[PDB]
């Protein structure tokens, strides 16, 4: 790790790799031996061992995912606008966030998801070194060292591990041009430091997820109705529907978001050291090599999705301010935003030139796309109905607004179920005894589509009855 | 109690009275010996012993309050409209209310406010016969008999006790034309029966107070923002601001509201017996006599304020349906209502002829009044801002909507404090050690008016410090 030399997928090699091989397995199993409807989604490509198609290696698929990181960046928004929007944003957070006490090492440790990997360098499930209150063994060593560096304000180089997302995808991403989504896996030391540094801010932010636009932490079922009611106070509604959000980010933008997180943290000088590490040119371990990724979002650790949401807030406000020429905090008097990483809903009373708005977005290097996928510009509508958020269509009736999962995704979840990793997606789980709460929730989702549809998906079990009456589950899913 | 003969205050005497004399005391004490600002509110008239003015007897003041009950009633809304709106209303409640289990005698008993009177015939504070889990002694006898009548579906005649409200009033109601507000005090037996009958429905209703328009049970601070956000989804806003709501009610309207409560109750046949008793010509004990009050609202027991809110819903929908000619449930797709007894906010997208709307209201015998108190018709506005609800002005900024208590009422609460009953309102409590949470809440209210105003009312103590910074209490009062 002196200085880089060599190139992989268009990016500089900084070191030999330590990551385990990409997974060739999926967690999805068919729920029935029957034949899939034509055009059905299926688990993403499993690589050379994947019986369904002869395709490239997982590594080559990953190589494709890394291309956008060497694309030239877009332009910075005009400096004066950028400063004004960041100030307005930080100021809104000062007026809303409840000041927090610092997180302990112990709190940082309990916060981590114990079911995912520790990443570099042990790449073991976190629970495997977890007593219930602390990390011991290898993980305990790594945790404790990182924590000492944190308290001394000393810098550590994060090391991320590249992976590919096991998820259902439309058949074309398997039988046409193979595509599978890139994942950044943080290292345990970095997760510890980020958690201690930023946990307080993130908790304060979540408590605020209804009246601030960063919606991370919200309950669709509990908060959706209030949040959507808010959006509906405004005349115009839209969704830029971005392509490649994370890989098109500018670190310079991310650093402005980071500055805000730092200043709003209980231990700002300790949190600066950590943020500077997160945002410095990143080491990504693709297996054979660790490569240097200077640009785009390094999406590994616990609080990046808030960092990303914050960057999104900054950009959206920048574009709106540039076009309408109204002050960032005045725009926020006339608008309601929802952000969750790249996911967005923007509602405003302001009269926005959509051609200019799209061009500004594209100029910052973002890739917004129209619903109909035709050559731009973005459209705006005068009804919230039809826009979506967190994968749920936004619906309004006489009782209020709410998020509804579309019939296709409901159908899909009836066709697949989660289980241990395996090679052949079309295998049926022999367990024939799953889906406790899952099923119930699916009844909930379906009830919201009317009795006709609900009666069909009440099909059914098992392989314990019986079907709750439609009225009853509809009432239960919408109301207290 | 055979049949009526004789007249008191224009109403028929049915029996000799048993009520204690009207109170000559107030619970309010000055917080300081200083002289009141001119025009300051003061506790209502205390009768012949009231040092501040030579005025009539409390009884004569009450006699005046009873006049509206012998006024001829207004017209019933056209039958076809009345049926349609009631059906739409009952139907909305069916789709929203979570079905309930019957209340036990024990549950009915614990629900009662133990700090108020038992009314007829013991007129003792309820706590005085209360073990912590059951009524013993006299109250136990009365409770247990009423409860047996309830379970056998047997009818009892309610007996209400007239009182006059001890509250702060504008000086003119003390030094000009004396006025003091009539109160109906239910009898313990009736409270038991109404509670067992209607408690389930009322609890189911309260759980629903955000997405149904009967707002009884709401928290201004917690629910206000969501509720007001809902209202703000609509274009037009208004408030009929009624005079003498309760005394202008038609029992026939109240019975339609009652029918709905009955059918939506877990023990409908038992609840019918009770509702028929509540709504039958009522015995009101004014001291010397029990008089028969056939019309207006008998506002005694636990659930009348929901009954009254429901009647209000019926009337408002009737007037809107009559004028706009759109179906009651379609009106409820295009509107948001809030009702709390006579207190109302009506928001709609519908294009309402306000002349026709006022005339329809007046025809049902209601007395809506304009903000400026000039000869009608009611106005509508296009902003919610400026309308009030539950005595709090409705305010909206970039964070959302919320209820704010006006500076005058805040000032007032600094000038008076609650204490034991006494004769001279200008006496200062010698206790000089009160107002724990009270003060804090007052800081909250004042913070919402800006730092300038907030700094002044931070005056202050005591007679423990210190003043929380304005930012801090503003944040605490608006947000989580
Ligand atoms: N489309 C969505 O709802 C979503 N979820 C997460 N992210 C953001 O994208 C990153 C990687 O997917 C995360 O860390 C978040 O910042 N976006
Ligand atoms: N103005 C208000 O907010 C209010 N509060 C209560 N009521 C109704 O009026 C009756 C007597 O005041 C109660 O039982 C309720 O039905 N109105
Ligand atoms: Mg969206
Ligand atoms: Mg009002």
Resolution in A: 2.5
Residue B223 annotated as part of some ligand binding site: no
Q: How far is CA B452 from the centre of its chain?
A: 34
Cβ burial of B307 (10 Å; 0-12, 13-18, 19+) is: buried
CB neighbour burial string for B158-184, b if at least 16 within 10 angstroms, e if fewer: bbbbbbbebebbeeebbeeebbbebbb
> Of B65, B69, B70, B48, nearest to B57 (Cα)?
B48
Task: Flag whether residue A477 sits within 8 Å of chain B, measured between CB atoms.
Answer: no
> Scanning the structure block, which residue is given the tokens 């309408």?
A324
CB contact under 8 A, B208 and A480: yes
Domains located in chain B, CATH noted: 1-22+79-214+251-299 (no CATH), 23-78 (6.10.250.3230), 215-250+300-386 (3.30.70.270), 387-480 (1.20.960.20)
Residues from chain B that touch A480, judged by Cβ atoms under 8 A, are 98, 207-208
Q: Which of B95, B229, B400 sits opposite A475 (nearest CB)?
A: B95
Q: How far, in Å, CA of A319 to CA of A338, rounded?
A: 16
Determine, for residues A211 and B329 on separate chains, whether the beta-carbon distance falls below 8 Å. no
Q: Where are the alpha helices (DSSP H) in B163-293?
A: 172-175, 188-206, 220-231, 251-263, 268-279
Question: Max alpha carbon distance in chain B (Å)?
Answer: 67
| R_g of chain A computed on alpha carbons | 23
- The first and second tokens of residue A475, run together, are 């009432």
- Does residue B196 contact residue B150 with C-beta atoms inside 8 Å? yes
Report residue B254 as tokens: 């109240």
Among residues B349, B346, B280, the alpha carbon closest in space to that of B318 is found at B346
How far, in Å, are A76, A275, B34 from residue A153 at the CA level?
A: 30, 11, 59
**Chain B within 8 Å of A479 (Cβ-Cβ)?**
yes
Nearest to A342 by CA among A453, A215, A188: A215
Torsion region of A400: left, alpha or beta (phi above 0 gives left; psi -120 to 50 gives alpha): left
Among all residues of chain A, which has the CA nearest to that of B232? A233
> Does any CB of chain A come closer than 8 Å to the CB of residue B469?
no
List strands edge to edge, sheet with A388-389: A388-389, A392-397, A400-404
Up-side HSE of residue A289: CA atoms within 13 Å toward CB? 18
Pick out the residues of the known binding site of A: 239, 241, 343-344, 388
| Token representation of residue B227 | 């509720």
Q: What are phi and psi of A450, to 5 degrees?
A: 100, 165
* Strand blocks (E) in A31-87: 42-43
CB count within 10 Å of CB B407 equals: 14
The encoded tokens of residue B289 equal 């006599």
CB contact under 8 A, A211 and B98: no
DSSP H or E stretch at residue A407: helix A407-415
Rounded CA-CA distance B294/B15 in Å is 15
Compute the distance between CA of residue B364 and CA of residue B366 in angstroms, rounded to an integer.
6
Ligand 2 atom nearest to CA at B306: 16
B/e letters for A355-372, b = 16+ CB within 10 Å, e = fewer, are: eebbebbbebbbbbbeee
Nearest CA in chain B to A477: B96
Work out the minimum CA distance from B380 to partner chain A, whole angstroms.
Answer: 18
CA gap A308, A300 in Å, rounded: 11
**Contact A343 CB / ligand 1 (< 6 Å):** yes
Does any CB of chain A come closer than 8 Å to the CB of residue B400? yes
The three-state secondary structure class of A434 is coil
Q: Are B443 and B457 in contact (CB under 8 A)?
A: yes
Q: How far is the CA of B303 from the centre of ligand 2 (A)?
A: 11
DSSP B231-268: HTTSSEEE---BSSTGGG--HHHHHHHHHHHHHTSSSH
- Strands of the A159-164 sheet, one edge to the other: A7-8, A11-16, A289-293, A282-285, A159-164, A182-185
User: Which DSSP string corresponds to B34-71?
Assistant: SPPPTT--EEPP--TT-TT-----HHHHHHHHTGGGTS
Report the length, in residues, of chain B. Answer: 480
The shortest CB-CB distance from B207 to any of A225, A233, A480 is to A480
- Give the Cα separation of A223 and A475 in Å (integer): 17
**Is residue A233 within 8 angstroms of chain B, CB to CB?**
yes
Structure tokens at A68: 């956008």
| Longest distance between any two alpha carbons in chain A, whole Å | 67
**Tokens, residue B224:** 């206000």
Query: What counts of helices (H) and strands (E) characterise chain B?
Result: 16, 16
A97: closest chain B residue by CA:
B475
* Residues sharing a CB contact under 8 Å with residue B358, sequence separation 6 or more, in sequence order: B368, B376, B377, B378
Contacts of B480 in chain A (CB under 8 A): 98, 207-208
């Amino acid at each position: 790790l002196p200085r880089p030399s060599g190139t992989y997928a268009g990016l500089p090699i900084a070191d030999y790799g330590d990551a385990p091989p990409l997974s060739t397995k999926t967690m999805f199993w068919r729920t029935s031996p029957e034949k899939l409807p034509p055009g059905a989604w299926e688990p993403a490509y499993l690589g050379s061992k994947d019986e369904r198609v002869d395709g490239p290696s997982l590594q080559q698929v990953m190589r494709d995912q890394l291309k956008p990181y060497s694309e030239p960046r877009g332009l910075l928004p005009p400096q004066e606008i950028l400063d004004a929007v960041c100030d307005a944003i930080e100021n809104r957070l000062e007026n809303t966030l409840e000041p927090q006490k610092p997180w302990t090492f112990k709190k940082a440790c309990e916060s981590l998801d114990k079911n995912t990997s520790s990443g570099y360098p042990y790449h073991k499930q976190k629970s495997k070194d977890w007593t219930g209150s602390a990390f011991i063994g290898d993980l305990g060593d790594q945790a404790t060292h990182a924590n000492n560096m944190y308290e001394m304000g000393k810098s550590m180089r994060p090391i991320y591990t590249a992976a590919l997302k096991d998820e259902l995808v439309k058949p074309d991403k398997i039988y046409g041009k193979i595509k599978k989504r890139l994942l950044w896996g943080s290292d345990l030391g970095t997760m510890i430091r980020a958690a201690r540094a930023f946990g307080p801010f993130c908790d304060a932010l979540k408590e605020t997820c209804i009246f601030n636009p960063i919606r991370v932490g919200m309950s669709m079922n509990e908060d959706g109705p209030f949040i959507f009611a808010r959006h509906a106070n405004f005349r115009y509604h839209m969704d830029a529907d971005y392509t490649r959000w994370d890989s098109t980010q500018q670190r310079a933008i991310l650093k402005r978001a980071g500055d805000i997180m730092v200043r709003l943290s209980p231990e700002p000088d300790l949190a600066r050291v950590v943020m500077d590490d997160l945002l410095a040119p990143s080491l990504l371990d693709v297996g054979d090599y660790k490569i240097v990724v200077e640009e785009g979002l390094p999406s590994g650790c616990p609080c990046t999705t808030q960092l990303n949401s914050l960057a999104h807030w900054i950009l959206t406000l920048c574009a709106m301010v540039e076009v309408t020429r109204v002050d960032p905090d005045i725009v926020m008097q006339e608008s309601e935003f929802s952000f969750y990483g790249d996911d967005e809903v923007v509602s405003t009373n302001l009269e926005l030139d959509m051609v200019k708005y799209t061009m500004a977005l594209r100029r910052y290097g973002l890739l917004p796309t129209r619903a109909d996928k035709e050559e731009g510009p973005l459209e705006r509508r005068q009804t919230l109905q039809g826009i979506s958020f967190l994968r749920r269509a936004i619906v309004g009736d006489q009782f209020g607004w709410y998020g509804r999962l579309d019939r296709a995704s409901i159908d899909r979840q009836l066709l697949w179920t989660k289980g241990p990793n395996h090679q052949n997606p079309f295998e049926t789980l022999p367990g024939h005894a799953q889906r406790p709460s899952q099923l119930m929730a699916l009844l909930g989702e379906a009830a919201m589509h009317g009795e006709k549809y609900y009666r069909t998906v009440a099909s059914r079990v098992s392989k314990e009855m019986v079907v709750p009456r439609h009225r009853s589950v509809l009432r239960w899913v919408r109301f207290g």
